[PDB]
Amino acid sequence: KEEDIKSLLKIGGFATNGQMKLFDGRTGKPFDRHVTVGYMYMLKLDHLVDDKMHARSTGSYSLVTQQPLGGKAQFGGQRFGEMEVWALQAYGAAYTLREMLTVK
Amino acid sequence: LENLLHPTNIKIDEYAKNATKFSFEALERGVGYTLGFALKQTMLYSIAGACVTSIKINDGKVTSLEDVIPCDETVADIILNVKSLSVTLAEDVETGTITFELSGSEEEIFSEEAKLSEGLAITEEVFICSYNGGKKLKIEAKVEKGVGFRPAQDNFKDGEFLLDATFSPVVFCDFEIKDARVGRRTDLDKLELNIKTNGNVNCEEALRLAATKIQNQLRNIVDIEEINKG
């Protein structure tokens, strides 16, 4: 219960609250209002950004459709969504839409 | 000992009569914040200055700002105008007294008008109020010279409106930190300083004077003379 934790904090000699006075490092001036400090044990999930960069400029094309491969398995590249085409139509940027579909 | 880099770049631009901007580049990472905060504090409160502290309009006759006076400006506006006045105090005189008693009719009031104690120089022609040529009115200004900033516990204590004394020529620092690239390492910080002054002293000279005081203090524990050589 909370009371047992408060007794443990008293044994530690800390005040009966999580928040404590802190001082900003750059100016060394204490912030108005005490700030709670906890261990907050944390873990790192298996989602590294090293493999997610997926930078591609020129890649091999699908034999049947002559189109770029996807998923980053070889050179990857980002597929253009149909909904994105609707947003381009709303913008009225026909030159961007026409160039992306044919030359790209 | 890779040798700490020096900024090696100084840019100075003046966009205002008393306002100037100083730009520094090539600083070490985190150097700009430490240098900027200390410089701002020293310039704002580390400089000795003389400023008006107590204003009395009618021998304590005027108790509140609400009280009407025979002029286009209310008592609070007149006090704001008087506080803006900048006074230089002679070393011999530790105090300055300014008298604004006027018997003139519908006459514009200016810093030239009003008799002052010896060792007081107005240094400006700022306008104060427009006279209505009505009943006799009086103005009393008290000038003191102090270092640092002094707060006033009571705005009005007896017959004089108490005001805090800035006691510094510099009015604004507003230092900022921006990223810079000196090569492969781009973590180096860039510092820009904007300074506004009453015009008693030039902003650049005032900044140099503020920097000198910090250097002077460490002279006992450090050799200032060797640092200058380079």
């Binding site: 609707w86 947003a87 139509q89 709303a90 009225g92 | -």
Partner: protein, 101 residues
């Protein structure tokens, strides 16, 4: 009221002129409503007005700029060559997910 008439009619042109109960016409026909103009309708307390609409639009397989009136995204009359239908279809669809029942 739930919706004010001025808020509903805001940004919308008026198909016909509005005649006050006093008999003095307040707004001419084919005039785009504006926030400054919107104040008069409440001040004159006119609860009913007639405004142009896409259904009423007479152009064949097209929408005139006046029938749409204010674009409502740039606070200006809709410019020609803008696809109103695509924006209208997307705006109704996006809000639907947040609403459940």
């Amino acid at each position: 009221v739930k919706v004010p008439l001025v808020e509903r009619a805001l940004g919308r042109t008026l198909a016909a002129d509005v005649v006050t109960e006093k008999g003095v016409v307040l707004l001419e026909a084919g005039t785009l409503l504006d926030e400054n103009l919107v104040e008069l309708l409440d001040d004159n307390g006119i609860d009913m007005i007639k405004v142009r609409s896409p259904i009423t639009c007479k152009t064949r397989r097209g929408l005139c700029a006046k029938c749409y009136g204010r674009d409502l995204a740039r606070e200006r009359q809709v410019n020609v060559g803008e696809s109103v239908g695509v924006i209208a279809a997307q705006s109704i669809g996006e809000p639907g997910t947040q609403l459940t029942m």
